Every structure is written in C-alpha cells, then in structure tokens.
C-alpha cells in the first residue's frame, strides 16, 4: 500500500534518457551517482534513517546496475550498451579476459529480458525489490525494509495481471531472474576486487568507495 508503480516508472525514466574493462569501470562509477538520485525517487526510501539508506545501496548497487545496463542492452546484437554511450561486443569482452561472465550476462539476463519483453515498469519494480533487501546486515529495522519489499511486488503483480492478462506466469518469471542476478552480481564483484588488487584498470573514487569494508 502507498507504493504506486507510476512513481517507480518515473524514477527509471528520470535517471536514464580502450580496454573494454576500463570503459566498464568508468561507466560503473558514473552510474553510482545516478543510482542514489534514483533511489531517492523510490517511494518511502528517503524516510529511512540515513545509515540504513547507506546499507541498502552498498548492498545492492552491483545488482541494481547490472540489471539496468542489461535491459538497456536488449536491442544490442551481441553485447551491451554502456551509460557512457559505448558498446561492448561479446568478442571484445572475450579478448579482455572477462568472456565467461559477459556471456552469462547476455545469456541469463539480456537475452531473457528480450524474449519476454520486460518493460521499464517491470524493470523498475525488480530493482526496487533488490534495493529493499531485508537481509542486509546492519539494518536498524529489517522488518520495516521487509514491509516495503512486499508492497513493491504487490504492485508489480497487480501491474502484470492487468497489463498481460494472457500471461499468468509473468510475475513469477520476473522474480525468477533475481537468483541469476544475485549470482552474476557476485561474480562481477569478484572481478572488480581482483582488478583493484592487480593494479591495472583505473577505478574512480565512488566505485572505489563501494569496494570498501565491509
């Protein structure tokens, strides 16, 4: 209740209108600023105590961004579209040493989003659910964050069973990409931690801050 899909969609439309790995890290730092503004546009998110807002964003920033550039890449042939406006083809990513993860992104996320034609409203609700992760360690009131998560998918299901009546399994099919997003979110994080360790691959301040402790 009090979690309209319209406010969520607006949040999605409001924020978004040589080494392939470097370009990706730069695009990630860039989007981290936009991610905060986005979250602020999510209903009741700003009513949470600052500390809890920090925990939620630091907990899902990686999954929230991977989902976004994937959906944006639905029109791309064999690759993804970066916020910076650059394309990263599968062959290019492969020649950089991150072909395994890249393929998982195209196969488990991009392709699947394209086949069911996930709309922006559906994307938004999914990211909102990811944002409202009640399992986040440190939350001063997990039950509260839990309450918001349920309100989000309550609106999403209503949206689906109203926009796509012919597809009664669309709602479940949307939630069934979260496990893959969690898995891919974790692998990507491993890569970032390795890149930081090695030294090569420039990492900006905000992206760098996210790789802090915990």
């Amino acid at each position: 209740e009090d979690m309209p899909v319209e406010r969520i969609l607006e949040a999605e439309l409001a924020v978004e209108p040589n080494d392939p790995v470097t370009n990706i890290c730069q695009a990630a730092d860039k989007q981290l600023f936009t991610l905060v503004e986005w979250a602020k546009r999510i209903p009741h998110f700003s009513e949470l105590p600052l500390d809890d807002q920090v925990i939620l964003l630091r907990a899902g920033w990686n999954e929230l961004l991977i989902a976004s550039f994937s959906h944006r890449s639905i029109a791309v042939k064999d690759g993804i579209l970066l916020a910076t406006g650059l394309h990263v083809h599968r062959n290019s990513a492969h020649s950089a040493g991150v072909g395994a993860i890249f393929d998982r992104v195209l196969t488990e996320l991009v392709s699947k989003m394209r086949d069911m034609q996930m709309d922006k409203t559906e994307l938004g609700c999914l990211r909102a659910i990811v944002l409202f992760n009640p399992d986040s360690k440190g939350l001063s009131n997990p039950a509260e964050v839990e309450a918001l998560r349920e309100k989000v998918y309550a609106s999403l299901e209503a949206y689906c069973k109203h926009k796509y009546p012919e597809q009664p399994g669309r709602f479940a099919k949307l939630l069934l990409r979260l496990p893959a997003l969690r898995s891919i979110g974790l692998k990507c994080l491993e890569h970032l931690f390795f890149f930081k360790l090695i030294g090569d691959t420039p990492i900006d301040t905000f992206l760098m801050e996210m790789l802090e402790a915990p």
Partner: peptide, 11 residues
C-alpha cells in the same frame, strides 16, 4: 567511511 555516499544522500 562512505564519505561520498553520505554526502549525496543528505543533499
């Protein structure tokens, strides 16, 4: 810690 994140959230 989380210097930048806090600033962007408060503004």
């Amino acid at each position: 810690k989380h210097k930048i994140l806090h600033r962007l959230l408060q503004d």
